[PDB]
Structure 1
Amino acid sequence: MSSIAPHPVVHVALLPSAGMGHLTPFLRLASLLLHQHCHVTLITPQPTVSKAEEDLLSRFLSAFPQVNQLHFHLPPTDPFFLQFASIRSSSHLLTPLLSSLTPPLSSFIYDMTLISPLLPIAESLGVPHYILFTSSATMFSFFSYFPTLAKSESFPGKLDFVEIPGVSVSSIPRSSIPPPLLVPNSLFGKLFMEDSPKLKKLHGVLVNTFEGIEKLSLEALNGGKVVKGLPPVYGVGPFVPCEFEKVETISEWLDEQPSGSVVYVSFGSRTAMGREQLREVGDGLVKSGWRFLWVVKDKIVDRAEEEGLDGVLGFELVERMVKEKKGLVVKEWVDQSEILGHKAVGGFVSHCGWNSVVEAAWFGVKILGWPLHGDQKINAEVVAKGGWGVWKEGWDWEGERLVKGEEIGEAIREVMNDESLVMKATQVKKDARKAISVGGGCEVALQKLMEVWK
């Protein structure tokens, strides 16, 4: 009535660390913020470990030319862990690029693996600053609680159960603890010890989760039950898959299969089974009798792939799969969300990386959990507690045992024959939509955050 002005711009800077499991939720968060009319600066540590990260970033930036990319050129062990440490070690060199941002920065959201080097930088900027935690809220509870465990003089040798008050997995046995945390000199063990005590300095923690799958962990974190004085935890999931991620023979094959008849199999973007274990997967898929879409990795890093899929699988397995005409096997980057959203896919053999879990939740696809490393056993039990997936506790971390094709096929048939899992997965899918609708946890949290930043 008394002013005609360019309405103020909320400017968010984002900093993702290594791996598709970190880039993907940051770019989906970016898309959400852009839809709330934020200006977004994206800091891109270069070069990326994997080609998939490289190509996704390119597709994102061409989909959103309004995004301001800040190049973060890194100086020249698990290759993604090595990148985590390099980004961390070079982070103190981001201050001049963040200080010079225009329009004025409103908030700063950085990767949970970068807390210690970035915290003083964020405090220098004088804006609300946050981590985006890319794993489950239950895993975040474990992360927050870790200094309480590691203070013990019998850590890590004497620790049989981790029972965090009020969370979605009330008892985490030692066999589900991320294995590096039980080795007394690992990168993540040191990161946990240096970073978790500094959580209280953040303005908040964003998590790609929602009440439909982690109601208890969300309530425990925000009620002071996990660690007193933790910053507010915002359930801003489910992160809905976005158009820019798409890159047509797979979808054409899925178009030919009966509804719900295909078992999708993938163990993420950075994990490769051993050769013998990999071939047992194929044996189990054939033995299951179900149609399957099996995504194979022979190397951790896609750039390192060097053997043809026929040689990886071997003559005998290839021969059985081509003869029965029930499965499709690919050693390439697929559009996992396009696949999970296809009516033909009725189940998901997943390593239970958190992004894959929440995608399965979004599409209501029941899970056969096969956790392999890291946070995956905790995530598998978050799913199983909700009754929309199952996992076999005795299969153990990848490389500890050889899971045979007979028991893989039995587990696949068990999950695909279980209609109670579909019922619960469909209610999760219903709640996934509630979370992003007006009044849902994600809509409420984003409006809170936007109002603080304004």
Structure 2
Amino acid sequence: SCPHVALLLSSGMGHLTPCLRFAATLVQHHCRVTIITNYPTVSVAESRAISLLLSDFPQITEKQFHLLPFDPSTANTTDPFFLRVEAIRRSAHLLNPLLSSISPPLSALVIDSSLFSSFVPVAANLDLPSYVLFTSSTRMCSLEETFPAFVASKTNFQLDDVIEIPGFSPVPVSSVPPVALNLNHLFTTMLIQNGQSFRKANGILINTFEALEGGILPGINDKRAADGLPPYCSVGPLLPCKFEKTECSAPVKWLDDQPEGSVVYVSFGSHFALSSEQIKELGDGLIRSGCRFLWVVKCKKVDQEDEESLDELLGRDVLEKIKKYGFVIKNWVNQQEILDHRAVGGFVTHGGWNSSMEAVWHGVPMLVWPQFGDQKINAEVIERSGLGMWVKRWGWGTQQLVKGEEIGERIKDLMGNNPLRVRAKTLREEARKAIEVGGSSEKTLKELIENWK
């Protein structure tokens, strides 16, 4: 009796990363796994990740969801990931026969959150227990669920008031994703409809553990069952795969020739790329901070289109000036393996929940510097844990520039902030004890498989 579970992927490495890690988890919990992929992906990272998963897990089946011919002329955004997600959403009627041909019979269809609204009827008509795979924080989930009612209660958008979130601290509209302020954006409509659609699920999966939220979960859950709402299933932290660990990289070699806790890791996810001026000021601040640093740089959103050098950005002598203090790279790195390194002492991040949870798992203090979307929300969550700190004065990264002096002076604070480390240890141990036998995530996930059965 090994249950068969199918996964519905969208696009974006931020959504793609926890998917495969969850699939590997189910596989390592005696379940049969089929992933529903769609090509061609926006970024190469996605394809390579899929290929790696299928290579290290031959018992995982891949079914290509052939999409409809897409017309980008009717989507009010130029972000290729949102576009791809929409392209998948507008062919929801085509997943159904694809879902039918799957043998043995499925026991659960786990859909990416960004695709839920379009694809929750497909699971409903096939009598399959549908699950929301939420690739972000819990507070952000309650935010997405409460947001439609909020936009409903208003005639039109709206100072910096507060939208009431059940179970969590209220959310200032400064924390609400900037692109969701105008109601005509594709991501806005998607967010609203999906947020409305989450209640049509049999359970919501969130990459988290009960000790991280503050022990506020088991109350919220049976406070939701009274309303007839799907339970917040804590299955995190989702462990990194066995192929995400290449002990013989180039950044690792450098990291091994540095003292411990003295290197600041800086990476703003995979989707985002800083402006030129912000990059220059960031380098300046890095040099000023007086600390060692590993710096991951992007100049274009899609990695398949980022082919300019920092010689063409910063200049030649600037980059030649910065590389002597630390390590500068404009390539893909393995965040998990780097954050696990003993040398790394802190993480300057955008606040992406994947990188955040990766830092929580490896016990590394964070300086949250939001850029867009759910990040600010996450920035509070992290700060309520005691693992990270964030400068509210910096606001959004896409909206406000920060000059090098402040950057260096705050990094100097990050490398000297000891309670963040003392909290990092205990939190890493709690996170590890959460997935072990008799943990929060273990009992939750086992309770999930038990109903499948």
Fold shared per TM-score above 0.5: yes
1:283-432 matches, cutoff 5 A: 283-322=284-323, 325-432=324-431
Q: CA deviation at 1:216?
A: 5.2
Aligned AA (2:31): C
The CA RMSD measured in Å over matched residues stands at 1.6
| 1:279 paired residue number | 280
**Helix, strand or coil for the counterpart of 2:394?**
coil
Residue of 47, 63, 80 corresponding to 1:70: 63
Secondary structure of the equivalent of 1:273?
coil
How big is the shift at 1:159? 5.5
The AA in structure 1 aligned to 2:211 is G
Q: CA deviation at 1:388?
A: 1.1
How many Å apart are 1:73 and its aligned residue?
2.8
SS at match of 1:368: strand
Kindly state the Cα deviation for residue 78 of structure 1 after the two structures are TM-superposed. Answer: 1.1
Q: Which residue of 2 aligns with 1:152?
A: 153
The question of whether the paired residues in 1 share the 8 Å contact of 2:116 and 2:132 is answered with yes
User: Which whole-Å CA distance do the structure 1 matches of 2:226 and 2:312 have between them?
Assistant: 51
CA contact (8 A) 2:310 2:316 kept: no
Change (3 A) 1:159 1:402: closer
Alignment match, 1:3: none
Query: In the alignment, is the contact (CA less than 8 A) between 2:285 and 2:408 conserved in 1?
Result: yes
- Corresponding residue of 2:255: 254
Task: Kindly indicate whether residue 58 of structure 2 is the aligned counterpart of residue 29 of structure 1.
Answer: no
Structure 1 residues 226 and 160: CA distance shift in structure 2, 3 A: farther
The letter for the 1-side match of 2:315 is G
- Cα pair distance change 1:175/1:226, threshold 3 Å: farther
Residues 249/158 of structure 1: CA separation in 2 closer, same or farther (3 Å cut): closer
Taking structure 1 as reference, are residues 67 and 225 closer, same or farther at Cα in structure 2, changes over 3 Å only? closer
Instruction: Describe the shift of the 1:385–1:365 C-alpha distance in structure 2 as closer, same or farther (beyond 3 A).
Output: same
Alignment match, 2:203:
204
Cα distance per residue 1:222-265 (max 9 Å; x no partner)? 14369933201101000111112346221110010001111000
- How many Å separate the matches in 2 of 1:221 and 1:179? 28
Cross-structure match for 2:74: none
Identity over the aligned pairs, expressed in percent? 51
The match for 2:136 is: 135
Question: For residues 281 and 221 of structure 1, what CA distance do their matches in structure 2 show?
Answer: 41
Residues 201-221 of structure 1: CA deviation (Å, up to 9, x unaligned): 210000001122213563464
Task: Choose from 2, 5, 10 the match for 1:9.
Answer: 2
Q: CA deviation at 1:314?
A: 2.1
Q: C-alpha separation between the residues in 1 aligned to 2:173 and 2:191?
A: 17
* Aligned counterparts of 2:185 and 2:218: Cα–Cα separation in 1: 31
Give distance in 1, aligned partners of 2:52 and 2:295: 25
Partner of 1:166: 167
Residue 19 (structure 1) shift:
1.0
Deviation at 1:24, TM superposition (A): 0.9
Once residues 224 and 134 of structure 1 are traced to their aligned partners in structure 2, the CA distance between those partners, rounded to angstroms, is: 23
Q: Which amino acid aligns with 1:16?
A: L
Which residue number corresponds to residue 34 of structure 2? 41
Letter in 1 for 2:443: V
Q: How far apart, CA to CA, are the structure 2 residues paired with 1:115 and 1:372?
A: 25
How far off its partner does 1:410 sit? 0.8
Q: Is the 8 A contact 2:4 2:106 kept in 1?
A: yes
CA shift for structure 1 position 275: 0.7
Q: Which amino acid aligns with 2:92?
A: S
Structure 1 gap ranges (5+) = 1-7
- Give the Cα separation in 2 of the matches to 1:72 and 1:227: 37
Aligned-partner Cα distance in 2 for 1:30–1:79: 25
For 2:381, give the aligned amino acid: V
Structure 2 Cα separation of the partners of residues 146 and 311 of structure 1: 42
What letter is aligned with 2:261? G
DSSP 3-state at the match of 2:33: strand
Deviations 1:13-40 (A, max 9, x none): 0012111111110100000100112110
Q: Cα offset for 1:426?
A: 1.2
Shift of the alpha carbon at 1:391? 0.6
Where 2:236 maps in the other structure, the secondary structure is coil
Aligned mates of 1:84, 1:49 — CA distance in 2:
10
| Match in the other structure for 2:444 | 445
Matched position secondary structure for 1:108:
strand
- In the alignment, is residue 116 of structure 1 matched against residue 117 of structure 2? yes
Deviation at 1:156, TM superposition (A): 2.9
Matched, 1:218 2:211: no
Amino acid across the alignment from 1:367: M
State the Cα deviation string for residues 129-182 of structure 1 (Å, max 9, x = none).
Answer: 101000001100111111221111345325511232331xx1321211111221
C-alpha spacing 1:197/1:249, structure 2 compared with 1 (3 Å): closer
- Secondary structure of the structure 1 residue equivalent to 2:131: strand
CA contact (8 A) 2:372 2:396 kept: yes
